[PDB]
Symmetry: C6
Subunit: 193 residues, 6 copies
């Protein structure tokens, strides 16, 4: 769990919000994603079927309705959110090594910039999820008219309800993280002056 | 096992009940879930079949009768139950770091609040399991009339008896945990006055 | 292997029988179960076939003849047998922590009670295995008349001979463990007076 | 993560660019590849289908259109890029062992040569990717006329859009790495004189 | 590798033969078994087919011709061969603990008895392999007349040649181990007098 | 990576060639084999198809044309090449233990003998690969006339081009290793006199 707290963004300049609350939500998102990755999204494409005899209609309809899986989006979001924290950690390690082989304001500014970048990454991933999948709920039946499917065909999604439940969990966690990051930057600015 | 005892909620203010009994039941639930996750619930959907020629009826009937798998419910319950313990642990680490870089009542109140939250999470997960699956036993044959299935169709469940056995084990463990948490809060309150 | 010896029940009051013989048999059972879990019992249900055209007869016949797999029974037996040892270990750790932050008879009684509980768990699992599967051998062909199968159908089991061999190994190991536990309690009682 | 930073090429003569920026991009590429390896490229061939009754046409068309998978190309690129860094590390360990059992310019020249070799490997892998797959986007339908397929047949690709997204990510990361390596060699040369 | 050398039977009374040669062959057998377990024996039963329309003939013929897989036999042989070494190690640990909380001949006799038991286990497993599979080579086609197969049917084995190669490797390694154990006991007896 | 360098054959008498160059090539071969084992050779037999209705022709033709897979050959080669290095390491550990409980020429001769044995193993595996697969390239279509296939049938290979690429990589690495071993023995002999 120490690696997870390192990836969260725990810093010596971090207050209680960034040190005890943000890291726990980060670990919670990691655990939920690990639980839901291959158990419920594993057969998303192999169990996707359409009512037709046309060869190749299943693959094109699946690609049309799921340009990128929810799990891959969440994985990319977690990686990009954790990147600035380890960037700051490597910078601190470099500074300590330089000190050993031979200010605090630079650390403070680096921390606030990294928090701002985390907030931006979370916001943009929320926006792209809203663009791709406007509704938080997943439906059982979809209508597909992409070539080579003739006219319109009915296709059926695997495990819509369980996927909806996990989507609600993940979106709520992301929203909480956004609120906590905004509170963190505001608190740091207030403490500065 | 040390990580498991940390996730259980072992604290310096914990009595014998919370330190030697609750953690063991937590580890027992973890081990049973690990044993039963993919061995018996792995083919829940791929082996689910219905007596019909209608395309898409298997998937919609499976989604209707199993909105969320038992294993996923137990995994979410374990994650949410273990969250407050590591929240308390991170708060203790933060307090110790603050002391290093420069009371007991706060620790006591944090511990009692975390125990209450664990009790609430266990109770709400028991209630939601009762709502979704009223009977502890799983049946071999189910009747499905969801669109697009015509009229009513017969569908067959994989491994009903083994799933019933593991459900009984998990429910008994959860009930024991609830009783132990109630005893813990009562004992702490009694020792307080 | 140290974790396995801890799970066996090695204690400072343990004699040679409980310290050098019981733990080795415990590790042997763990290793045999790990070898045989998914190699030979992996396709128990997917390769189970019956001579019929009736939909759903394979699943109901498999559920009728295998209410719970042998591997899951052995896993549950190992978990329940190892539970009292780690309960005792956690109690000892709690006692030592209490001593650090500030008798032998309590340890002796706890050890004998844990050994008795291990003996009881092994005996009850042997009895339930005898109830479910009276014969140690597994047959190639079974006769199934459960609804919806019409009349009686023939069904065929995967790898009967290899499963029989591993069943003999596991039963012999369990019997040896029972005998050793009885010898342990008798020896401790004799040394007491 | 320490092994990853070692494989990146962190050296005592490295500046900030090579120590805190290049290593993070290396770890980012590793993580994205781990996420995308078997999740989205796992069923590239088993789900590849063509509209024909000719036996063997699926395999020959897949081999014609995908001589080597994107994931394998990226894996080989990462291995070859990380080779000179560990070569330098082993040379440093050998030099230190020789010193223990009994100049800086040799280390400086070895570092600059290793950086040049990393730049060359990244450039050649970019060029070979451009040769094999000129467009960054993947199409849904391809036309195949390789023997034994009669005339021309239509074949359908699995998950074109998700693969396009991950390809864009990987190409952008590789370009950033190339730019950073060029900046590193230029900065080292400038500091030399 | 330290655990492997412990399982081999390295003891303070061991000579060069038992300390540097037997352990290497043990590790070699472990590595070859790990390589060949699921790569070449993984599809032994799923790819086994017979030329018939009779339901259930494939399973009964496979069970008749392969009562227990070669890989499972080798796994059991390795476990049973490694058991006496860890029994001796646990006895030594028990003796040292007894010394700490408060002769060499006992250690010498325990070592020679354990070597004899290892020799016996290897010999009996060689004999049982000879009984089950008289020829070291595996054939492509087998003739099966077990009920319910009508008359005699032809069945085909997966990867006969690769399995033959690995069988030759494993048998040669086992024979070398037997010879080395005999040399070890003879050398110890000679050194005794 | 330390275990890999130990398996390479790094010794206190090793020069730069054996200490910094041979070990890197060994690790490179290990990594390439790990990447290519199950990704590209995983479906070698399940996707192998022939244009016929004869039962059992696919398996016999696959066995005829691929007596042993390339990946298994490379795995065996790596194991046998790494065996003498760990034999020498265990001999050194035995010598140091003997010294602790109570010359350099023996170490020198052991090192040169181990290098010669590594060279011999690499050469013989190269020769056997040349015998089994004379051409470095793999073809799409093969002609099979083994019983029970009637007359001659066409069979199709999975991923010929990617397998050719990885074969070229592995053969080049093995040739480099052979050249480096010859240079090592020549350099040691020259330094001796």
């Amino acid at each position: 769990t120490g690696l997870y707290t390192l990836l969260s963004g725990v810093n010596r300049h971090s207050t209680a919000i960034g040190r005890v609350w943000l890291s726990v939500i980060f670990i919670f998102r990691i655990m939920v994603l690990v639980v839901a990755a291959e158990s419920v999204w594993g057969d998303e494409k192999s169990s996707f079927i359409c009512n037709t005899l046309q060869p190749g209609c299943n693959s094109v309809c699946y690609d049309q309705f799921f340009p990128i899986s929810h799990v891959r989006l969440w994985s990319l979001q977690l990686i990009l959110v954790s990147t600035p924290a380890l960037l700051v950690a490597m910078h601190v390690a470099h500074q300590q090594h330089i000190e050993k082989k031979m200010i605090s304001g630079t650390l403070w500014w680096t921390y606030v910039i990294s928090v701002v970048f985390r907030l931006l990454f979370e916001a943009v991933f929320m926006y792209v999820f809203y663009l791709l999948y406007p509704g938080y709920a997943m439906v059982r039946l979809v209508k597909c008219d992409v070539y080579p499917c003739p006219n319109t065909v009915d296709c059926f999604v695997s495990r819509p309800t369980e996927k909806t439940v996990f989507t609600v969990f993940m979106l709520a966690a992301s929203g909480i993280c956004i609120i906590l990051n905004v509170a963190e930057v505001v608190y740091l600015i207030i403490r500065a002056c």
